[PDB]
């Protein structure tokens, strides 16, 4: 079966204010792109080609007046609302329809992966037809995030959102992917004490049914969110040093296409035209007669 | 009276896609918009009355953040650039601005730090014949008006993008005019680039030996946001000072408060809003705690 | 088995007159000692048996800072390179540390980073044959061993420090040699810059048909740390990674407690002379604490 | 003339294992050595005689990195510190240095940058009698000496590392003192914290209404690289600047030369071995650029 994508850009501004007051997180860049590229770029890289755009009422057109409707990089982009920040789970709601009777997987806008086969990482759980599926990794401060308890066997067996007490260093990522109940139980979620429907609690429906697999994704990998002015920066420095180093570009969503076959070497070219004149467009074009391994 | 200009334009092609939901000059510097660094710059030199120069699509952006100016004491004006033509248009865009009074533009994306830029600033301030302008030593003259220097230290020329500098001395972002600016702007023709240059009419001004170029010392930084690399050493750099001193560089609310132009009651109204962050954190201690 | 050379000589003049003071090698990445990273790649590969090859004056430091690696389960040696005459001198030096035995070399000032690294190593290790190296994609081939591929991914050439590379990949400063290696360098001429060249010993296995060259992917971070900028990227690379996780890279005290190579106890006497620092209790977490 | 004091002692534990194998003070700020930083401070002081204090481990290792300074147009001597119990110490070790003169303190590891710092420190220099300190508006006052003002600006009491700072204003690492000091520091007592303190000699100087305590205000930058955290922030902040400029912070034989402490010939004499690298060709451009 078919997966389809959302991306949940929403959010509350109240915090990087004054910093985000002309501009909303996720529609900031790091460093060279627009934050957005690089949660779609993971979606891309799942093999997801439908995908839905989920922001506030006045960030859904901007998205759309930079995305559109995907054909340029051959995706299928749609928009929908999220009236209030009341809970990552709300996806589901807003999304009900989009997601119809497929298989689906969330990624938050401000989420930033990096890393060596990315490819094999989320094919795995991309491959699950029953279930759901989750990425832990290792963090300093796990009292931010949902936190997934595992015995001394490996196994999974508890999560908690922002434990003030957190039994493990293990966050749950903003990356899950999920089977066709994901809806029937997000319907029938009810708000938690802080406010919000919660996407720890529509995993933990999963676990009490023994049906969440829970992924590690390894140290070797570097997952970066840009919650704060002083992470942002450190998000940036960090894709700047690698793109530097390497003459390569992270998270390139038209490299992504053109290497995944969903646009041909003149459709490239037609995207690198209207950029020729800066670096970006300059990248793309070197693309067509490059072999990058 | 000296009146301000920030030229806030510029020709977006460059840094796509990354700004291609947002202009440069829109985007944050670290915890605060651009624009709030040549605000600042202005606000510092004394002056409350400005005019931001904008393009059709970043003019209603830049009303929406910053509005009428009057919470934070200043009035603030707009107007728009319909196509980049030179920063010299500026002048004839904020002619009746200007009307019959002193000026000074700053342009948009350029960050100022230092010890007593308000006495740097108030030296040309006070100067109400001619124009000033600073120069500031750069590892890359070539894209920047340049100045050149005679043994005794007087300028004797100036350049736009020289493709053999005549020293390292860069024209900075930052202008002073009398009241002879919106004229010899006037008879200016655009130049092979296709611009109306302002480095032409601080030409004129140095032709008649009414150009002061002020030194702006190697202890100030003088810091350039409008590259993805450039962009992101100014973040780290005023991230790194802010830090270390539990401080802002370049607050507007701050700067206003210290000058007056709002009292407490007006500042505790500016924090509300904002109190459920670090800036709100920020504003609030100001009332409370003896700064030097 | 297979034994392990580690380079960490020359001037390191690009990084004069920080380097007047101390070593290149001997500077940090952050936290730890630039060593501790090629150090850690050997052991990551399985190596255990090591020799360290520095300047008369700095290897006696090198001895200094790492013991005989008795603390970490390690067989550390060292000799001197009297003048920095090319890397694949270490064959020469060390050739009676090698004997009969397969080798691995790499350079003192670089550093890798990523998912199954481990595997990666292990699996050009574990070759009892030929020559391995491993080729990434960089900006700047110019400065480094560059290799080119016919169109069906064939390794066809390899030429050093190239002004016009025939591709932009490089050749890393890591390579593993079989039985071959200590004859083939035996036989090196001086080249140009005046070095027996590395590049000349792996062009001799290429010509034989037998270099493989892995790529390596740009899922991995691979730097260098041989320039002012480059040491500085390092260094915000690692902070950003360790701040983050929770978690150091090349931690040789933790590589050795994972691979088995020292126990809960060893462990636990490596910490308590750190104990008031981070780096203590970083060793002190790792008994209690299972990392995936 | 006024003698001066680098106090390049301690241990780092904060910085291990990284200072395993060196002192922090030798460790580089982005292109040049810690002790550049603070030295280049009492050159710019107008100070030429100096003392370097450091642990007996570290004292040849300053010894061959500035030798006695006559290349420089300086006088340095050195002394030990057997172990770190005190800035206060090194008036007490420097005793016979010190003689019957005029003397000043710098900690190793602080950074001071901004305009007109020159004019700031001769100031405090230029004064004959009392003690000079300055006053710096941190985020963590506790780490430091940190001073109480009264309603009216003046200096009322001095604490050192306290738990709830009176203030955010921290005393800086670099002290000026009349010819009191040594029998001052001759009287003091351990602290609790177990060290002869500097903040002790300053606050017998304030009993007396002796204590000059200047502002040095937010447009300058003080940083200190104690941390690794810190070493990483302090190196991007020079890094930029020098950048940006094509300028050098803290260059000694850049002082030297402005000073007129050497000559033309003994500067191209001292670019030479470094003429393969930046450094060396920085000095090479002073010969023949007017920098203002």
Redesign the interface.
């Known amino acids: 079966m078919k997966r389809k994508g959302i991306i949940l850009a929403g959010g509350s501004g109240?915090?990087?204010?004054?910093?985000?007051?002309?501009?909303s997180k996720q529609?900031?860049?790091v460093?060279?792109?627009?934050m957005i590229?690089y949660p779609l770029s993971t979606l891309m890289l799942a093999g997801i080609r439908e995908i839905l755009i989920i922001s506030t009422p006045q960030d859904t057109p901007?998205f759309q007046?930079?995305l559109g409707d995907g054909s340029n990089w051959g995706l299928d982009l749609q928009y929908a609302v999220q009236p209030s920040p009341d809970g990552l789970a709300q996806a589901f709601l807003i999304g009900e329809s989009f997601i119809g009777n497929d298989l689906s997987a969330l990624v938050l806008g401000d989420n930033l992966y990096?890393?060596?086969?990315?490819h094999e990482?989320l094919g795995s759980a991309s491959q699950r037809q029953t279930g759901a599926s989750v990425f832990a990794?290792?963090?300093?401060?796990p009292e931010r995030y949902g936190v997934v308890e595992?015995d001394?066997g490996?196994k999974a067996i508890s999560l908690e959102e922002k434990p003030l007490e957190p039994k493990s260093?293990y966050a749950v990522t903003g990356l899950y992917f999920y089977d066709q109940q994901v809806v029937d139980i997000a319907r029938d979620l009810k708000p938690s004490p802080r406010g919000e429907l919660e996407i720890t609690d529509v995993n933990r429906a999963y676990l009490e049914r023994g049906q969440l697999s829970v992924e590690?994704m390894?140290?070797?990998?570097?997952?970066?969110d840009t919650g704060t002015?002083?992470s942002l920066?450190?998000a940036?420095?960090?894709i700047?040093?690698?793109e530097?180093?390497?003459?390569?570009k992270?998270a390139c969503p038209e490299e992504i296409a053109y290497r995944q076959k969903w646009i041909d070497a003149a459709q490239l070219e037609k995207l690198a035209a209207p950029?020729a004149?800066?670096g970006?467009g300059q990248y793309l074009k070197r693309l067509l007669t490059?072999?990058?391994?």
């Open positions: 109240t915090r990087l204010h004054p910093a985000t007051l002309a501009i529609l900031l860049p460093y060279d792109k627009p590229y901007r007046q930079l990096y890393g060596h086969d990315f990482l990794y290792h963090v300093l401060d595992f001394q490996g260093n590690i390894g140290r070797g990998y570097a997952w970066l002015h002083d920066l450190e940036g420095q960090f700047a040093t690698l530097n180093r390497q003459g390569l992270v950029l004149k800066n970006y490059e072999t990058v391994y």
